[PDB]
Design a protein around this nucleic acid. Sequence first.
DNA 1: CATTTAAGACGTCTTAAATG
DNA 2: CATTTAAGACGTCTTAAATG
Lengths: 66, 66
Amino acid sequence: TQLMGERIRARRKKLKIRQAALGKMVGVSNVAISQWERSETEPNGENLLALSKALQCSPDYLLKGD
Amino acid sequence: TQLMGERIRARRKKLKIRQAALGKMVGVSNVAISQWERSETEPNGENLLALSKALQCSPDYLLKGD
DNA sequence: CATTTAAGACGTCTTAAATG
DNA sequence: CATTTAAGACGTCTTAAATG
Ligand SMILES: [Rb+]
Ligand SMILES: [Rb+]
């Protein structure tokens, strides 16, 4: 059921920051955040690692849940 | 500095496996492993994580090293 | 034989416009 | 306004051929 992009957005909403603010922490645009959250694309390896740090969770959690 | 792909190859050689056998463990072709090792491309998010498990090191070690 | 090169399909980013 | 859509450049894969 649950997609990675849904967990990315839940974790960003928990921080209460905008897509642009998260993009800035990660080193990508607000649009890349948006594409990830909507499961349009998935983050590449370097961006997944930066995202999981900004989000304070592990890459595995983002990728596969729990 | 040392590139991620040289770290991938050094770790694979430690394990004494061919690129095809690593590929099998990760879920990609031997060519993808060749591409990564030669820094032609970098693994995407899901592949980087699968690669790090198959190699028993962390995603951060692969991407950034010590 | 193991690995690299090549070509090409599809994925992951970018900025600007549109939407709500 | 924040976000999503659009258009488009370069990135990541696959198989087949070439290389050694
Ligand atoms: Rb408007
Ligand atoms: Rb408007």
